[PDB]
Amino acid sequence: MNQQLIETLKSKEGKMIEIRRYLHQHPELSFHEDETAKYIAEFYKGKDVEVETNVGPRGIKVTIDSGKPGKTLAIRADFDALPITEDTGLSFASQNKGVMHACGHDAHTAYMLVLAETLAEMKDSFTGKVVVIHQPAEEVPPGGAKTMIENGVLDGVDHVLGVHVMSTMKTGKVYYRPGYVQTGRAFFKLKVQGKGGHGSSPHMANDAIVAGSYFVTALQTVVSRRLSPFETGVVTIGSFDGKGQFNVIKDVVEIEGDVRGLTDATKATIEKEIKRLSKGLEDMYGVTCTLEYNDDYPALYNDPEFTEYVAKTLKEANLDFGVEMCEPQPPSEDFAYYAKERPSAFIYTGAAVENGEIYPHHHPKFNISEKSLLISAEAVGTVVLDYLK
Amino acid sequence: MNQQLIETLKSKEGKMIEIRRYLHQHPELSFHEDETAKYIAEFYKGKDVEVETNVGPRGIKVTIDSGKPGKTLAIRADFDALPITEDTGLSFASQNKGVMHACGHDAHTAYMLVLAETLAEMKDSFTGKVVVIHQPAEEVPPGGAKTMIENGVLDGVDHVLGVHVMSTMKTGKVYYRPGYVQTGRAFFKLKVQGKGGHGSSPHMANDAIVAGSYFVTALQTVVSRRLSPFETGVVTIGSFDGKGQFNVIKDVVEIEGDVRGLTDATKATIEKEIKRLSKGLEDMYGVTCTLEYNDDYPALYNDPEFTEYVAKTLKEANLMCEPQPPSEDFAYYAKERPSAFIYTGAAVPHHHPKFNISEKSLLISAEAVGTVVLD
Amino acid sequence: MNQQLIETLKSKEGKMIEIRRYLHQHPELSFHEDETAKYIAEFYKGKDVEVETNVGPRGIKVTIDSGKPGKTLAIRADFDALPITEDTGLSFASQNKGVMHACGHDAHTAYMLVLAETLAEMKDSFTGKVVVIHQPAEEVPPGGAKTMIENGVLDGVDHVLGVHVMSTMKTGKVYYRPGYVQTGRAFFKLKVQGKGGHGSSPHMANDAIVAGSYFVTALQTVVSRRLSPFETGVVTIGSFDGKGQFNVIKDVVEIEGDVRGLTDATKATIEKEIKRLSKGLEDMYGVTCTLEYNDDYPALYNDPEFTEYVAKTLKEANLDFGVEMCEPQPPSEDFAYYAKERPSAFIYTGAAVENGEIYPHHHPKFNISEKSLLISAEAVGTVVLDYLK
Amino acid sequence: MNQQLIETLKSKEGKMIEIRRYLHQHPELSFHEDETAKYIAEFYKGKDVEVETNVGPRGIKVTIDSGKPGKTLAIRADFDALPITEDTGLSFASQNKGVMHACGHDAHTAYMLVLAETLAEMKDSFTGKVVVIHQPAEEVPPGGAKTMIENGVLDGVDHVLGVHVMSTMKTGKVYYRPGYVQTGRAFFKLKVQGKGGHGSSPHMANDAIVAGSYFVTALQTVVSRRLSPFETGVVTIGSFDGKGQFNVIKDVVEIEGDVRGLTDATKATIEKEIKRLSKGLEDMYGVTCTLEYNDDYPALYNDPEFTEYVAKTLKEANLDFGVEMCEPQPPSEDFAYYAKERPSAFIYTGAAVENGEIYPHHHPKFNISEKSLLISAEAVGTVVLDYLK
Numbered sequence A, C, D: 001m002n003q004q005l006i007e008t009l010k011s012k013e014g015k016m017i018e019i020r021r022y023l024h025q026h027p028e029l030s031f032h033e034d035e036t037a038k039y040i041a042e043f044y045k046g047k048d049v050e051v052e053t054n055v056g057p058r059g060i061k062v063t064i065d066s067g068k069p070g071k072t073l074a075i076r077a078d079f080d081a082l083p084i085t086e087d088t089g090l091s092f093a094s095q096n097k098g099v100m101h102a103c104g105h106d107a108h109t110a111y112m113l114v115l116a117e118t119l120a121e122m123k124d125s126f127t128g129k130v131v132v133i134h135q136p137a138e139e140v141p142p143g144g145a146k147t148m149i150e151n152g153v154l155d156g157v158d159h160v161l162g163v164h165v166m167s168t169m170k171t172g173k174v175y176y177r178p179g180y181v182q183t184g185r186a187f188f189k190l191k192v193q194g195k196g197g198h199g200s201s202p203h204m205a206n207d208a209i210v211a212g213s214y215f216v217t218a219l220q221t222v223v224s225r226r227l228s229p230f231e232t233g234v235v236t237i238g239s240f241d242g243k244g245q246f247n248v249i250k251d252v253v254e255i256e257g258d259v260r261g262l263t264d265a266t267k268a269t270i271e272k273e274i275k276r277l278s279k280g281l282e283d284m285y286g287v288t289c290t291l292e293y294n295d296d297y298p299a300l301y302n303d304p305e306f307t308e309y310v311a312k313t314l315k316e317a318n319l320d321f322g323v324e325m326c327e328p329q330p331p332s333e334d335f336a337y338y339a340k341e342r343p344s345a346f347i348y349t350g351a352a353v354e355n356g357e358i359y360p361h362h363h364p365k366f367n368i369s370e371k372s373l374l375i376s377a378e379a380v381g382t383v384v385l386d387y388l389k
Numbered sequence B: 001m002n003q004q005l006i007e008t009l010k011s012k013e014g015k016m017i018e019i020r021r022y023l024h025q026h027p028e029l030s031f032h033e034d035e036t037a038k039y040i041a042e043f044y045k046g047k048d049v050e051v052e053t054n055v056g057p058r059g060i061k062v063t064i065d066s067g068k069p070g071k072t073l074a075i076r077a078d079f080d081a082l083p084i085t086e087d088t089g090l091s092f093a094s095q096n097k098g099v100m101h102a103c104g105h106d107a108h109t110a111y112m113l114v115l116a117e118t119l120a121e122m123k124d125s126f127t128g129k130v131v132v133i134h135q136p137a138e139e140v141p142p143g144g145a146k147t148m149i150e151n152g153v154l155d156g157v158d159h160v161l162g163v164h165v166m167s168t169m170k171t172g173k174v175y176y177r178p179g180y181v182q183t184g185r186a187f188f189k190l191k192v193q194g195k196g197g198h199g200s201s202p203h204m205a206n207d208a209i210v211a212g213s214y215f216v217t218a219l220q221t222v223v224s225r226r227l228s229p230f231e232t233g234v235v236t237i238g239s240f241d242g243k244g245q246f247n248v249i250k251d252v253v254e255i256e257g258d259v260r261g262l263t264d265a266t267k268a269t270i271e272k273e274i275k276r277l278s279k280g281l282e283d284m285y286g287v288t289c290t291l292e293y294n295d296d297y298p299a300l301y302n303d304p305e306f307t308e309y310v311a312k313t314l315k316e317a318n319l320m321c322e323p324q325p326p327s328e329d330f331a332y333y334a335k336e337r338p339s340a341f342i343y344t345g346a347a348v349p350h351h352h353p354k355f356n357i358s359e360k361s362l363l364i365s366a367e368a369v370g371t372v373v374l375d
């Protein structure tokens, strides 16, 4: 059945490319992807699948039932874009001012639509079901994966597989790693309340800028002391709002930060240590601290059994692309929510452009090699056919 | 021959109060004091004095020449009001909403006007000339005293004498102190330029919030290590503008600061030391620092001979303090001439919304200044 | 009467100088002044005074009782020397080890002995009692004043007067200031207990050098923020004992500091603020702190009423030297212990060498004009006869 | 062989254990391994190999020449012990008080000796040469690999293979990882020179304790800001020698620190950032800084091709034991010197006790499963035979 799969996919490469470009041209923001969601549901018209709409708001769950009893494998593609002004480059650059598919979600949707169509004409080659998940709202908390889980997107599902194109990794192969593969994320706001007063009488006041500044310096020990050197953690203060008047001792500063930890234990340690510094600042400087600490996407955990199965299957099929281990990746990803409800594997397709500058994700000049489309379909399809045989 | 003085004053007290209430009712901002400069000029109409209406921007210099040679004493009273919304509940409260005479400059003006008219009447009783300085724009930099000095005001003057009403000194005498008595001021703006980037890749960025935070931390050593314990210095960062985005390492912060020193040497040391740190931050964190350092009011030096001189002269007629926190642009006169600045008790909160004072200050002020003038 | 006193003291000026030079030739360290205390006691043999000698260690109190009811004035002179090798090269330079009268205590004792001798001959000319306090151990904490006081040196005393010769002030006047004139002192030891460990697993340790280092950084705010700009305070850490093995996270550090305040209120603010930072360190870094905070010399408070009276009394006596107000002085002085227990005045006699370069107190080249002896004796005697009229 | 090798090795397991236990009983410190070196030389007597004994001090190089054309492969076992008092309660525990084979270097030497004897018997079964490297001094810098390399140990050598038993990885598998597997090391001494002075006149001095403390504080940013979250690095200050007189402003402080980096670029970035802070302290505080920065063991780099090869070879043979990927490891390892010169693999054999408590390397209670001996020899031999086929 694999042989047939590959040539059908190769013969539809042009269609994937044409679809990516249309979607690239009409990107929509997270929680406002009205046209994209409608386009995806319309694609499946005339095709032999069940499409369930509005799973999350704009959640789309297309079921490909072979008609025969068996496992259920979910395959996931996200479709939201970002608030970025496109600077490509390209004839099919976004005509929706200020928004751009800067993370390859258009490409994820493109290959998945064509793969799903293809798997639908091959019900005679597998058992059980494929659940194709077209997910909105990946980019902005609370995200789409969460809302889709709450609406039962994973009812019946044994395993989840997802693919992300990587504009930073070499085209011509797919990449994998069991265990923790992408960082989880938290956000915090800290209000540091001292006491304002005239700038010539500091003894009468309690300087919030000094306290907040000492806090920023002490905070560096969370990463530098409190985490193991073999852990992966980040604590960034992106906003120190202490704007005031020249000669008035500042009464309050607002600090906002974000946190990444590659494992849940690392996230837990960071939260504990930032809370210790924040509470202790009150005793050290006599300020009042108001900490709001909001957990956000968990770290993405690639189930070791399933992920190794995926890499084993792909190496044993002998396709026109290589398969190899990779390092963990910096950004957070809401696929991590699937990966925490079911054993899952999130894998990567090399998408670095052949010629010209290589830009990272979310950059205005972001671009991928379009032959990542076919490789993604071939890879995911191969897994689907072996799994569910 | 100073009971005449004394008695003539005691008599005209109630005149001082009216005037004070009238000015308190119609207050005007620094550099916007058109009607008060007019009123002060008109008050002297009919009186044997010479009045300059623009020395300079709205500076009022009234000279009282005895017609005889030839020593020259300048006495100073300021007259600008403050941008605050009066909340005293007074029968003569500000009619100019948002503006208030909340430092007592209306009182300075009131008593001085009345002492000046009195001194015009005793031209026989003294030699040389008196220069009455009615000064606008004390409150808002650059002043104030500054322009006036360049524009004529000090020409031929050998000593300057001034008085402030202190709403927080009981109110039964006039307080003083020789030597450096009020701090001078400077301010600065520091741009700390690093390199912005996505929050998950700190190694590709240079965090300006971290550099700036470390700067504020090191800055504490200026007062705590670089100055003598016996010096008086203040280095305050009142503005740390590092407002940004969750999720983005901040590329630039803007720091604004406010410096005080009790001596001009202390101010220079603070400046050197802030510059050392600013420059050092660049080497230490790899940032670019753009420091704008603005000098402001000098420290107020009460000439020690002349100050005891006036205290002795006052003591020997008939019915010391700590240095004071505010900066005072009188310091500019005191930089160019041997001068003395003394205080008059007025306890009924300076620059406070509910600012009030004892009205016995007015009369005490005229008594002490007049006495000194005749010597 | 005054004319008597001045004349009498003038005729004895040679005796003052001879005693001073003798004492300068044989100086003794604080708490080791046996030979000097015996000389002081021996001086009073043959003289009509009451000499108490055990109050306290090497402390000598001599009472000159008019035999009539009245007030009691204490007058104080110290006699300890300093651990300094004299390189002044004077004929009468120290021939005792490596110790020198580098603070002019030989001059205080010398004029005081002769003044006391003179006052005993004038019991007719005053009422009540003079108490002469010959005090050891001024230079080294805890000091002699505190010890003499707990041994009843101020029993029944109404006021205390003291004089210090000043090598940096112009000879020819006496100097005074009401209120706080000299700084008080405190000292502290802070033990910072963390958790030691192998240098490459910071996450398993609690780094005491890091906590201690943050402490010292934060401590700068005591003087830079918590004190009024017009207060006079210093907080110095002279010892940060964090010596260990380069590759071991340090378990404990010992920090030692020294504090000065010109007012007792300044000293109290400093103590309160250092205690706040020590306990805030525990809460921020999870270390355990033991702060040992030892108050030492109070700041020297010159009673305004008494000091003004002294100044006035000297001005209105027809004396051959001026009297003028001075600035407060940097060094600490254990006379402050008396000034704390009784309304008191500490005044200065100008002693700067009229020719040649002037050296400060506690210097190897330290030298004083010997005219300061007579001036001191006349000044103190004038106050005595007037106060006890 | 290749089934001949395994059978021969299996029949010699008893011998492996006896050598291990003997060596365990008589451990010797780095640079002092006279008797262990002798023993190793004594083992090859009467065995058909070419023994060189003075390749650096205590360096033993054994060449097993097949006589035939082929490649050359060096295999490495280290033989130094540690300054640790044994507490295992084993019958063959160290009889050299205060010294213990607490890293399993006795086991490395044992399995290697038996393997090399076996490989000598099979010169007909391979082509090229085997260079067996018996290396002293691994534990104490500057260790043994460098001197041996300087003395021509890697001459003609194409690849280097080394094995470490791992007391905290499960018996019985062999573990591997391409790329950087073990951290490199550096150390530094910083002298921070200000200007000493009386503790209450800080404006006249330049406080080295203050500057030193601000330096430790700023140093935290090296790891917390200058390193990628995905890099592995440590900066520890183990020594802050600022002991002084509590009331003197300290003239000089000595700081000593320890650095780890998993890659050589990480180590280089750490050196750069510490030098930037050091040089920058001079500018900010006006102190003089003398930094001695000494690079020690480089990070251990496993050549990707050779280790993938080593892993493939092991898996395809049919050994009694499994083969799987490990994480990189905290400790330093002077094997890294060979790995920089020739394409190398350093792999691990699981040696955790199967019963009772698991203790790490350099622990007084360190203990290993003795099954790791046979497994190690079987692994290294299999690579030798397939590589030299």
Ligand SMILES: OCCOCCOCCOCCOCCOCCOCCS
Pocket: B194, B195, B203, B204, B205, B206, B285, B286, B287, B288
């Ligand atoms: O003079 C400083 C200019 O800053 C522009 C930044 O571009 C220079 C190279 O920086 C690119 C990647 O950032 C590296 C992180 O900076 C770490 C230390 O920054 C030192 C400033 S050269």
Ligand SMILES: OCCOCCOCCOCCOCCOCCOCCS
Pocket: C195, C203, C204, C205, C206, C285, C286, C287
């Ligand atoms: O606990 C305060 C902050 O420390 C955070 C760093 O934690 C490092 C690991 O902490 C372990 C906690 O144990 C506390 C001390 O235990 C001492 C006894 O342990 C001895 C065996 S290691």
Ligand SMILES: OCCOCCOCCOCCOCCOCCOCCS
Pocket: B272, B275, B276, D195, D203, D204, D205, D206, D285, D286, D287
């Ligand atoms: O500002 C950039 C250059 O600074 C000018 C010289 O600075 C030298 C470094 O000393 C800074 C520390 O100042 C401490 C005060 O010391 C005062 C006495 O020093 C005498 C010469 S070291």
Ligand SMILES: [Mn+2]
Pocket: A102, A103, A139, A361, A362
């Ligand atoms: Mn994205």
Ligand SMILES: [Mn+2]
Pocket: A103, A104, A105, A138, A164
């Ligand atoms: Mn994405």
Ligand SMILES: [Mn+2]
Pocket: B103, B139, B351
């Ligand atoms: Mn004002």
Ligand SMILES: [Mn+2]
Pocket: B103, B104, B105, B138, B164
């Ligand atoms: Mn004013």
Ligand SMILES: [Mn+2]
Pocket: C103, C139, C361
């Ligand atoms: Mn002394």
Ligand SMILES: [Mn+2]
Pocket: C103, C104, C105, C138, C164
């Ligand atoms: Mn003394």
Ligand SMILES: [Mn+2]
Pocket: D103, D139, D361
């Ligand atoms: Mn070891």
Ligand SMILES: [Mn+2]
Pocket: D103, D104, D105, D138, D164
């Ligand atoms: Mn080892």
